[PDB]
Design an enzyme around this catalytic site. Structure first.
Site, PDB file in Angstrom:
ATOM      1  N   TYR A 147      -1.515   8.420  -1.216  1.00  0.00           N
ATOM      2  CA  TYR A 147      -1.202   7.311  -0.759  1.00  0.00           C
ATOM      3  C   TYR A 147      -0.116   6.612  -1.451  1.00  0.00           C
ATOM      4  CZ  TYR A 147      -5.294   8.034   2.179  1.00  0.00           C
ATOM      5  OH  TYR A 147      -6.069   8.379   2.981  1.00  0.00           O
ATOM      6  N   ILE A 148       0.115   6.573  -2.761  1.00  0.00           N
ATOM      7  CA  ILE A 148       0.566   6.001  -3.783  1.00  0.00           C
ATOM      8  C   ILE A 148       1.956   6.891  -3.965  1.00  0.00           C
ATOM      9  CG2 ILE A 148      -1.203   4.510  -4.757  1.00  0.00           C
ATOM     10  CD1 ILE A 148      -1.478   6.772  -6.692  1.00  0.00           C
TER      11      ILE A 148
END
Lengths: 442, 273, 442, 273
Positions: C117-118
């Site tokens: 996600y990051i």
DNA sequence: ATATATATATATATATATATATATA
DNA sequence: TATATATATATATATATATATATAT
């Protein structure tokens, strides 16, 4: 603050309509056109990405399988590893799409080495048969970097041999010889009756015969004495691990035979000596039948052509002939698309080359003087002439040696060559081009 | 009985120079099948990790399937000498390559990579000096690494054992030290140089159509400058070897014949214990 | 067939020697120059590989961590994931070298989101300090694609704050302010006495003092009544997960206090209510000491500077002053190397530009006629004049518009500019260049 | 007692519209701390998928740490009504937005995203029609999603409960419908729409300096061309959001206020299995 | 001879700087 | 009060063919 009132039925419908999109990009049903399962499509796209700069460089299979998650493959990297490992060998494929450097397995032992040790690259077969990849359809999911399907000139779905067992559907196609598939495609292209392409397993010295649609894949053997026989081939479904542990192990357990290994660089081999307790029928036909049944040398395979069309739907074919016909139709449309785009592109290129040749001729003669005209004072002067409408950015900005005597003639030659190419691309049809691409497979 | 994954050699169990390959992994056993000499070379795959066996407890370490299969294949049985040596007879001394070597009428001499019987050397017009047994230096005789006693009766199925592991599996746990610890149960194998190790090249350099193999990175770093234009491949395991190179390494092997030092019983505790 | 005589000592020692080279790339000891542990160096090299093209594009942390295995990082992908996650935030770094897009954590909760996600990329800080990368030493291991170390202009090992424990060794450095470190570097470079760079922690509002060498890291607080106080900061070693569960929860269990959370955008906060059971000292200093001890507002940190120096060895420094001095010396060496190579490069560039300008000024007047000759005819003719020796492939072969009047002066302008650059890079020392690079760390 | 990972609200347990956020993962709870307001919004992180809660004994669900903490924080207990409604009194009917609406004197009306008391509406100079209780259509009364009864006494610590999970976990596993199955044990939460689910945008498009949020891919594809020069980022999870967008999504939330159908008990034995 | 497998020169689409307008705290 | 892009514009360089050539079949 918004307060929407979504019901539980909508919740269940939307949650279910994401397991129906997570199991369709992983449906083990080969596409009709490229014969690629989605994992193989991602592996091929990744190996094409890595092959940029050096088509001949062997990339690690771990790297190839690790780069597929960035292309839109939402499943594990082990799946890509196994797809590449099974795709990069020659024993499993008539027309392998990936090359291999390392231990990728064999018919004897059918497991490749660790993905960190074996290297792979897209083979010359892929570049030879997979054309028009710039006109391949763009996937509806914009995270799917590889296209909807690739564009081989022949139905690669038959060459290598597929076997996919899914939930509610199952596909099974037998590997067809590349020459027979090419001949069938040519017959479908010209419009002649399509003969059934013959099934030819890769690196298989046995024989295959068609009876009632089913295929009898029989191994071969030769007798050297009254009690000594030499198994010189076994059906393609076997490997030495399972042939010994399914057929020869019970036979030597019941005391019928004693055997020793004879495998090697020439496939399989099992020299067998019989015993008194193993009765041998005097009749030649009875002896041959009981040997074929006892030694597992005959296997029956049924073909179930379940493929995914260019529309994305699941299609089932009774015989591969109609598969050839429909594939030829859709690939014919795509070759027409390539014809049209190439026509327009070669027309633009010919106009550009003609303008370049005219400019060089005039500046050598001296009609257009580039001396002492600054930069934004000759550019607009060139913009006035009709031939230099949108070509001035490329017309003044080409190197000085173009203004010598040798390259002045070389530019006109390329202008005439591009005009001839435009005429060629605007005279031929899909028949001619799809034929011409077909003689460059062997 | 019958070992499943074992690939029996045609001459296995006879008086022939057979070999067994304890290859790491089941993938390279297919390459072995393709390239092996069917008469002499055997084979067996090792599909795992450190085999321990330094903790003894014969029954406890016979639980391991790989150890049991190795014992079944090689003919080795724990707690019993691998083979019985020939009885001592008449001792002879000769000058071999300018070196005085004291042997006995029934040993074997390693000459140019081949083991030759004492009788064959005597029949080859070589001078032999008869020396009384009481006047023979046993300390000098034991130190000679080129002389080994001839085997009178052997229960071994294979005349040699050739280990075959990956270069990436070194130091970070391995089977080579583990197989060494297992084979130490019969030191007579090491005394005759029976247990060996196939040296897989670390760097394979393709000099045009030819190939040069470097078994250490330092050798390549020292010899790369003198080499012509070439491309190299880091052979991090047997899986990265092509079949042609695997055959060139099987049919023309280079052996790191392990020799036990004077304190082998103590050197195996610092690693495994 | 060869028979070598390895003696189980060259076996055991070599087996142990290979476990050494495997642990000298995993030791959690930062290089003295770039402040990088090897995993962080691989992550930075991978993020620099991905930053080719668009430098501002945020790449997935999963991609960054998955690409490090191909650069020579033999450890897990989770190690690279965690190194990138810890590098890409701002709470943990006084001078981060990776940017972040997503939940990379904070001081309140020190856990980043999933690496899928990051997103992260190399920040402007990296390009601000980390220069001369083309002159970074090449690693002895040819599979170590990243250099031996990078070359920041200031000792980044002190800025962000390292902490690692190795086999028989341990390092611990406290995060120093970028301004103080740069001032100390300037003092060392110009030969002045170096003042000890002050320690400041990133996103810390408390105070740090130095007694007996150890650093007293104190959190601030403020009172609002005889039983109400507002804790407005806690030492950097705490997070809300451990400060609540190691101080406030035990005090609640003992009935001393009742507290409510006040952590917000600005940072930490815990308003505390005091009970009658909690005895209050009349003396203000006794009360302050009791608060600082009971509530964990006092943290003492000891600095253990164990840094891998330029030679590749383990050097332990007494104080950060000598680290800065030796770093300035070796970076002085590398800036001098850059100065020399740039001298030799800009001299050739200046002479090439001068030859180009002369050729253009001659063909303007027609001294070197390009018409009526061949490219192979002109190349040899230009090779005769002394100034055109290796520039003929770049002299006839540059675009036509250079033969105008406006662009005939932009070549003389570039010739003069390259002469000026040669003067600037050949009349200045390492001192001046290191000073100029130091004034761009704002 | 108390819950460790739980982050209390200032007015939790009081008469306010305090919300509890069931974040998926312990990372998003830091963003929640940074962006929430202390008065109303609470918080609790869920690490993984909560175990199924359908057709199991109350002790079995009470074994799970997450479910036990949910019960502790929310003030909810299995098998007992979440709250007790006010006693039925005089029924009043009015016309809201041209639609006839039948309520009591102690009901809540959902107008423009805000719940307004019947007494407040009466004080707002709005005409009310008194209707006898026996002459009131209960079926039509219970079909109005904007009408809910005011709670006399409630044991619930938080007025509402908001679910906040990753967008790539909706079918590839499940954390959301399992929470719904657990919450279904108190239907009164759904009948007044207490259980909610914030919509994390699927695509966040940066149109210059402003931002436009698309909650499904179809909406973005429909509006892609009408948008100006812009860049997009697929928000595959909560961790993919920056703090500013997290604040814009918490302070200005959009709620999928779930409604239980007439046969929700039968519908839940479909995905549980 | 027969591709074919390598070495080698060419246009072209990036990666990198190359200039310089555009604006958030 | 500076910011920050930022948009054309160069550029030089890493590519994807085209083709010369030594080569095994």
């Amino acid at each position: 603050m918004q307060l929407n009132n979504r019901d539980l039925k909508s919740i269940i419908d939307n949650e279910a309509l994401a397991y129906a999109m997570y199991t369709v990009e992983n449906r083990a049903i080969p596409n009709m056109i490229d014969g690629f399962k989605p994992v193989q499509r991602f592996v091929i796209a990744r190996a094409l990405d890595l092959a940029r700069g050096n088509k001949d460089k062997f990339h690690k299979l771990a790297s190839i399988a690790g780069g597929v998650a960035d292309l839109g493959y939402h499943h594990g990297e082990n799946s890509a590893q196994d797809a590449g490992a099974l795709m990069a060998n020659t024993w499993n494929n008539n027309f392998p799409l990936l090359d291999g450097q390392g231990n990728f397995g064999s018919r004897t032992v059918q497991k490749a080495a660790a993905s960190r040790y074996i290297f792979a690259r897209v083979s010359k077969n892929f570049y030879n048969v997979y054309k028009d990849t710039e006109y391949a359809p763009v996937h509806q999911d914009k995270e799917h970097i590889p296209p909807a399907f690739y564009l081989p000139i022949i139905p690669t779905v038959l060459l290598n041999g597929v076997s996919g067992i899914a939930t509610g559907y199952a596909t099974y196609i037998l590997p067809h010889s590349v020459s027979s598939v090419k001949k069938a495609v040519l017959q479908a292209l010209q419009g002649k009756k399509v003969t059934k392409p013959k099934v030819e397993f890769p690196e298989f010295r046995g024989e295959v015969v068609e009876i009632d649609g089913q295929y009898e894949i029989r191994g071969t053997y030769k007798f050297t004495s009254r009690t000594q026989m030499h198994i010189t081939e076994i059906p393609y479904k076997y490997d030495r691990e399972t042939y010994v542990s399914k057929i020869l192990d019970p036979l030597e357990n019941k005391g019928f035979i004693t055997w020793d290994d004879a495998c090697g660089e020439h496939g399989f081999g099992f020299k067998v000596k019989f015993r008194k307790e193993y009765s041998l029928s005097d009749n030649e036909e009875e002896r041959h039948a009981k040997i074929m049944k006892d030694f597992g040398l005959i296997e029956r395979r049924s073909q179930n052509i379940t493929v995914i069309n260019e529309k994305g739907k699941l299609q089932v074919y009774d015989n591969v002939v109609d598969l050839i016909k429909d594939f030829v139709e859709v690939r014919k449309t795509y070759v027409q698309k390539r014809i049209d785009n190439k026509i327009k592109e070669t027309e633009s290129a010919f106009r550009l080359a003609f303008a370049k040749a005219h400019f060089i001729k005039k500046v050598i003669s001296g009609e257009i003087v580039v001396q002492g005209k600054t930069r934004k004072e000759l550019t607009e002067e060139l913009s006035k002439i009709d031939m230099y409408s949108s070509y001035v950015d490329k017309l003044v900005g080409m190197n000085i040696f173009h203004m010598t005597s040798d390259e002045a003639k070389k530019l006109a030659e390329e202008a005439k060559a591009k005009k001839e190419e435009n005429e060629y691309w605007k005279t031929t049809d899909v028949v001619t081009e799809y034929t011409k691409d077909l003689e460059e497979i062997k | 009985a019958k070992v499943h994954k074992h690939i029996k050699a045609n001459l296995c169990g006879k008086d022939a120079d057979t070999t067994l390959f304890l290859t790491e992994g089941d993938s390279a056993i297919g390459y072995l099948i393709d390239v092996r000499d069917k008469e002499l070379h055997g084979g067996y795959p090792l599909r795992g990790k450190v085999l321990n066996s330094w903790g003894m407890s014969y029954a406890d370490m016979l639980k391991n399937k790989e150890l049991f299969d190795i014992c079944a294949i090689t003919g080795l049985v724990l707690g019993e000498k691998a083979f019985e040596e020939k009885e001592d007879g008449e001792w002879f001394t000769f000058e071999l390559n300018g070196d005085t070597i004291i042997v006995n009428e029934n040993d074997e001499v390693q000459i140019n990579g081949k083991w030759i019987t004492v009788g064959e050397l005597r029949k080859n017009l070589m001078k032999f000096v008869k020396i009384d047994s009481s006047s023979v230096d046993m300390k000098k005789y034991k130190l000679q690494n080129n002389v080994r006693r001839s085997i009178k009766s052997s229960s071994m199925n294979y005349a040699n054992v050739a280990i075959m592991t990956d270069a990436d599996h070194d130091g970070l746990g391995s089977i080579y030290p583990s197989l060494l610890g297992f084979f130490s149960n019969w030191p007579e194998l090491f005394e005759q140089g029976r247990i060996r190790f196939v040296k897989t090249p670390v760097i394979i350099a393709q000099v045009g159509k030819k190939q040069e193999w470097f078994y250490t990175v330092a050798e390549y770093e020292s010899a790369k400058d003198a080499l012509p234009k070439h491309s190299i491949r880091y052979i991090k395991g047997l899986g990265s070897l092509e079949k042609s190179e695997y055959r060139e390494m099987i049919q023309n092997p280079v052996y790191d014949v392990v020799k036990l030092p004077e304190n082998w019983k103590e050197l195996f505790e610092m690693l495994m214990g």
